[PDB]
Amino acid sequence: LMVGPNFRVGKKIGCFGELRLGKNLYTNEYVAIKLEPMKSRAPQLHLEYRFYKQLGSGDGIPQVYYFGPCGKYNAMVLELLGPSLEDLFDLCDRTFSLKTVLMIAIQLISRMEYVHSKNLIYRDVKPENFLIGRPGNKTQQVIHIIDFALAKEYIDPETKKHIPYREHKSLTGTARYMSINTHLGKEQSRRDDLEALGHMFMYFLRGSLPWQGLKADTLKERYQKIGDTKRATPIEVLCENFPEMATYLRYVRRLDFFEKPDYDYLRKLFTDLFDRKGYMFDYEYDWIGKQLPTPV
Ligand SMILES: [Cl-]
Ligand SMILES: [Cl-]
């Protein structure tokens, strides 16, 4: 029924546990309640909360309100957001205008810059993890990054050194947007968040990516096929008609493991495009004036 003093648990609104609609009874505000069975054999909720705390208050970071026990679950109470870019992607007939994608990209490079500024790498880029604010809120226009369960501190706290390079890192997440180097079992760094973004920007522009249908008998082999197709798809072909996207992807693909990405350059690739195309950054995304779903 209740999370901590004041948060009432509500209906299931999503599915390592479930997401519930919650209400702060003390403020009359709806909230998100991410639950996780206490009997989880591989818990992620507490480490995710810890990453959220580490992120603090950022533009497009979901506020977090409570982490505590909830019957036979552990609960994390955070800010209730709207649809994901994937949900929105579907409402927009699985393509987005260049303006939508550019407004998304400009934002999410800054979102990613911020995450990286807090000594974290994200490692779970995917449209489903980028949520607009709520249908009426001051933040419906803002694309928020969620789900920090797969994040990593890429700067070691004691030494203040970048994490060392390594390989034979096993593959587990979403294969569709992951960097080529993630496919090669390399330790992910800041570059890989940014490349995965580029893949997703291309997914949005094209409607699909050319490795998105690939199936294999094991998942290891499927990652391999997808990775092979990524390597075998020239950026110039993947990004035909989108020159700055190819420029973005080459840049991020060529980043050294340790290299701090030049976020300003990448953002300017896109803001110059945006300007040149005659676009106005007015948050008038493709899905504006559509019937968007609600959590509540
Ligand atoms: Cl009430
Ligand atoms: Cl996939």
Annotated domain spans of the chain: 1-81, 82-296
**In the block, which residue shows the tokens 């060529």?**
254
* HSE-up (13 A, CA, CB side) for residue 63: 8
Q: Looking at the domain that runs over 1-81, which CATH code has it been given?
A: 3.30.200.20
Q: What are phi and psi of 76, to 5 degrees?
A: -125, 130
Measure 58 CA to ligand 2 centroid, in angstroms: 29
Burial of 137 (0-12, 13-18, 19+ CB in 10 A): middle
Spatial distance between the Cα atoms of 32 and 64, rounded to a whole number of angstroms: 9
The type of residue at 71 is G
Spatial distance between the Cα atoms of 133 and 63, rounded to a whole number of angstroms: 11
Strands 29-37 and 64-70 turn out to be unpaired
Q: Which token pair is 165?
A: 């390079």
Reported resolution, Å: 2.0
Q: Looking at the domain that runs over 82-296, which CATH code has it been given?
A: 1.10.510.10
Spatial distance between the Cα atoms of 75 and 178, rounded to a whole number of angstroms: 29
Which residues face 162 on adjacent strands? 155
User: What experimental approach yielded this model?
Assistant: X-ray
16 is in an annotated binding site: yes
The reply to whether 82-296 shares the fold of 1-81 is no
21 is in an annotated binding site: no
* Cβ–Cβ < 8 Å for 14, 23: no
Ligand at shortest distance from the CA of 28: 1
* Torsion angle of C-alpha atoms 95, 96, 97, 98, degrees rounded to 10: -110
Ligand at shortest distance from the CA of 223: 2
Q: Which token pair is 166?
A: 């390594």
Measure 83 CA to ligand 1 centroid, in angstroms: 24
Closest CA to 107 of 126, 90, 132: 132
Spatial distance between the Cα atoms of 7 and 24, rounded to a whole number of angstroms: 5
Spatial distance between the Cα atoms of 7 and 23, rounded to a whole number of angstroms: 6
3-state secondary structure string across the chain = CEECCCEEEEEEEECCCEEEEEEECCCCEEEEEEEEECCCCCCCHHHHHHHHHHHCCCCCCCCEEEEEEECCEEEEEEECCCCEHHHHHHHCCCCCCHHHHHHHHHHHHHHHHHHHHCCEECCCCCHHHEEECCCCCCCCCCEEECCCCCCEECECCCCCCECCCCCCCCCCCCCCCCCHHHHCCCCCCHHHHHHHHHHHHHHHHHCCCCCCCCCCCCHHHHHHHHHHHHHHCCHHHHCCCCHHHHHHHHHHHHCCCCCCCCHHHHHHHHHHHHHHCCCCCCCCCCCCCCCCCCCC
* Cβ–Cβ < 8 Å for 87, 68: no
Spatial distance between the Cα atoms of 77 and 289, rounded to a whole number of angstroms: 30
* Cβ–Cβ < 8 Å for 109, 194: yes
Q: What are phi and psi of 39, to 5 degrees?
A: -75, 10
Spatial distance between the Cα atoms of 215 and 169, rounded to a whole number of angstroms: 21
Spatial distance between the Cα atoms of 25 and 77, rounded to a whole number of angstroms: 13
Distances (CA, A) of 160 to 55, 75, 119, 156, 164: 17, 32, 9, 5, 12
Q: Which token pair is 37?
A: 């069975």
36 is in an annotated binding site: no
* Cβ–Cβ < 8 Å for 82, 132: yes
Which residues face 35 on adjacent strands? 18, 75
Distances (CA, A) of 41 to 17, 22, 45, 148, 160: 12, 25, 12, 19, 32
Q: Which residues are catalytic?
A: 124
Spatial distance between the Cα atoms of 188 and 121, rounded to a whole number of angstroms: 8
